[PDB]
Every structure is written in C-alpha cells, then in structure tokens.
Amino acid sequence: DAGAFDKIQQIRAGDLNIGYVDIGPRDGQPVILLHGWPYDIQSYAQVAPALAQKGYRVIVPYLRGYGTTRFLSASTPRNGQPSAMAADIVHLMDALNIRQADLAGFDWGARTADIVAALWPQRVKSLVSVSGYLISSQQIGEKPLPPQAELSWWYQFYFATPRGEAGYRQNTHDFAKFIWHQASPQWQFSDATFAKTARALDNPDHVAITISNYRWRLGLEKGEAKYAGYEQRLAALPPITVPTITLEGANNGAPHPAPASYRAKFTGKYEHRDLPGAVGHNPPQEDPTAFVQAVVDADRL
Template sequence: METRHIALGDLDVAYLTTGPEDGTVALLLHGYPDTPWSWRHLAPVLAGRGYRVVAPFLRGYAPTGLAPDGCYQPGALVADAVALRRALGDHRPALLVGHDWGALAAYGAAVHAPALWDRVVTMAVPPLATVARLRDPLLVGKQLRASWYMGFQQLPWLSEWALPRLVPRLWADWSPGYDAREDVARVLAALPDEARRAAALGYYRSWAQPWRRLPRYRREERAVYGLPTHPLLYLFGADDGCVRPEASRLAAGLCETVEVPGAGHFLAVERPDAVAAAVTAFLDRESLDA
C-alpha cells in the first residue's frame, strides 16, 4: 500500500491506499492500539474487487497530525471520516469499514451522513445499542474487568509513560496466541512521543471526561449511538479479550453478525482469510439484493 497525505482543514491526514484510482472508495478506519497496517490483508482483497481502498491514520497517530483543536472525542472521528470521504472527490456511495474506535466512527459517520455510504462493515465493537441488552450482572462484571485499562488510561503522565509497555500487553490479552510483534512495532512508531501518546489516550479521556468534548461535534457525537440504516455486517472474534464475545453476541437482531472462531480482538490480522470470506460474501449478497 502507498502512503499519501490530504489536508482536512488544518488537519494533515496520512493514509494508506491501494486499488484502481477510478474505483469506488472503500474507507477503512483502524482502532486502538493499532494502525491502518492491520488492513494489510483485507485491503488487497477489496482492491481486487475494484475498490479504491483508503485507510487513514486517525487523528493523533503519526504521520497524521495532532488534532488542531486538541479534541479526540468520537464525534471528531466521525467528522474526520465524513470530511475525508468528501475530500476524496468520488460521489458514488462508498464502502465503510471500521475496527474498534474505527467501528464507533463508522456507526457515527453512517448515521450522520448516510448518503455517503452504501454498506457498512464493523469489527470488535458492536453497535452501542447493545448496551441496553447488557442485563446479565455476571456478564457486566466480566466486561468491566476486561475494561480495566480504560480507568488506568485516565491517569495523566503515568499512562503516557507506561504506554510502550501497555500496548504489547493489550495485544497479548486481547488476541491470545497471536504473534503481534510486527503490529506492536507499528503502533509504537505511530505514537513515538508524549504528545502522540496523549492523543491516543485522549480518545478514552474524552469518553469519560465530558469537559474534553467540543460543542462543534455535538451532532456527530449523537450519531455514534445510532444504528445505521445501511446493510450492516458486524464481525467479532470468539476469543476477544477486550469486548467479551458474549456482549458482541447481543448485536444479533440489530445487524448481521459473524463470530470468527480462533480469533481475538484484532481478527483482521489473526484470521484474515475468514474475515475476507465474510466480507466478500456480504458484499456479493448485498449486490445481488440490490
């Protein structure tokens, strides 16, 4: 994949791209702690189907710039996804794919600007409407234990300092048995200093600390909690150590779901063939339905 840059106002966005220049856009959004290089297996599959794949480094992740407004709330990610899609210039509805924080941005972008997209694929974080279905106290307790890192990352300075040690631990805990050395190295290269690490942690701090959110993203923020009206495929790993698979199963009925056996949180790199098969089957089925 080739690296390019595009200006979204004052934000310089770096992105990986492959596929025909005149192809329909497929926008692929990564999560935490991750980079767009996790799309290295799915991107050529989509490019082979004629898509122009665009996989940006999210705001704060080098070589994309730090947020000019200092904001890393989900609504800002939605605004970036919508702005990037429009800046790419193709007016055909695009394919939207998101993992983890990228999944939240994908839900929000699809709800906020529905005309820009025709189909949505998300991974590892289900639609937030599933939270209303979390009624089992045992499952709530398990999920809270798995989410311990969110509380730790509210701590200033200490969590920035610990991030180079935390990232490999999270990959090991969330995707047990997967050799993540290549991916971890790319994450650490994208977060090389305190300012970049604070940006990545700012995603979680804005979630828990509402005073970090800006009114300008109010509409995009609300959209994150909505459910896209587009055909929506949600994939999750049966061994995910971050979002409990029992919680992901609650998305059944809200959208099409596929549980990938032998995969954890970073399923696109753990089981690339299974992920590609599920995505291409979804695209083929929806094309026939259309």
C-alpha cells in the same frame, strides 16, 4: 507492486493532514478501512492489497493521534471524542471526491464507521463492523458494569488519572504491547509485527488522543461545541440503516457485546458472523482472509 502499501499519501482534510494508503484501480468501488486502538494501518496490510487485486479502490488512513496524520494547527484541541473521528473521515471522503464508500472497522474504527453510517448513511454503501454496534454516550459511559467487566476495561480507568497519562506517555510501547496480548491472547504476533505499528504510536498527539478518548467515554471531558450536535444525535443510539455485516472472534479478550444484544441496531440488510479460531480483537490483522470475504459479502448484501 510489492511496496504499494508502504506509499503513504497525505491530504488536507478538515482540521488534519491525514496520512493514508490509497491502492487499487482509480475507478474501483471505494472501501475505507479504519483501525483501532492501539493499532494502526498495518491491521490492513494484507486485507487492502487483496481487495485491490479484486478490483476495489482501498483507502486506509491513520486516525487522529497515529502515524503521519497530524493536526494542521497547534491550537486545535487533541480531542478523542467519537464524532470528531467520524467527521475526520467524512472530510477525507470529501477531499478525495468520494461520494460513497464501503466502510469497515474494528474498535475505534468500528465506532467511527458506525457513526458515519448512522449520521451520513448516503455516504456509506455497506458496513463491516467488528463487535457490532459501538456507538454509545457519556451518560451510558458513567454507569458501572460488573466487577470482572470493569477489570477487562481496566486501562480506561487508568487513563482517567494523571498517573495513567504519565504511564502511557513514558511506557507507550510496552503498554500497547501488553494491551495487544490481553485483547488477543491466542494471537502469536511477532515482535516485529508489533514494532511496526508501535512506530505509529509515537505520533506526538497519540497520548493526548488516547487519554481524551477514554476520558470522554467516562464523562470526564466535555467535547467541543462544534461536535455537540452530533453527540446529541448519537446519544439516542440511532440505528444503522445500511447493509451491515458484524464480526466477532471466539478468542477476543477485549470487552465486547454479545451479538444478540445488537441485532436490532441494524435495521437494513444484516448478517452476523462468528469467526472460528484463535481470532481475537483484531480480525483484519489476525484473519485477513475472512475479513476480506466479509467486505466483499457486505458490498453485495
């Protein structure tokens, strides 16, 4: 089915009605592919059908603040703290009756998969984590980096101000597109490619989730009480015990750690891969062949 990745399913899960693609054989090994900011499920439009053809069951959800994922209740805080997204994924797994899956992600999606693997390792068969170990804490997020590193993170400081919230809301499309070009300077993505994901950024919670994510990271927002236990566990920087492949691209313009720096955060089976070429901040969308290979390899590591 040439149209399969365009059939969006909906399911109640936790505080959300999650929008997701679900393709591949129903009895196939499950794989859950998680996008980043400001990207969406289209990051896996080529990866997912390729995995499905090789006998995997593939789930590709919109995160909170994107696409057709919505809050069930108007009164639920539009909260972007890290463990909230991890909880969302566990609720999705539960709602789908998926006991264990391979997880893969980049940017927020990598952080989210990292958290699921660290806090609920029994649910994670193996992990593909682009840019390594992305769990951190508010206490760390308060500490400055060298001036040029802060410039590379400029937008998070913009988002800490009311002017930034207003800019992101008024100029969502242009702002996200500028970010895409900064993060993957050698990716010659088409206007239509961008526009297809931009549609999902017009979700009515997208701004709120974005600003919340970056304010929480800087220690400028208190999370919700029901996630405080998870955040306390995460602040210890717990290691990931499940088989993991980490990926990085040679032309990633977005802030990322050096691979040696995170080697000892993965205490089980492990491999790191530098992807050669023009590959930037979004390996699955930019290099779907290599990303698929990584998921298959991690699933057997």
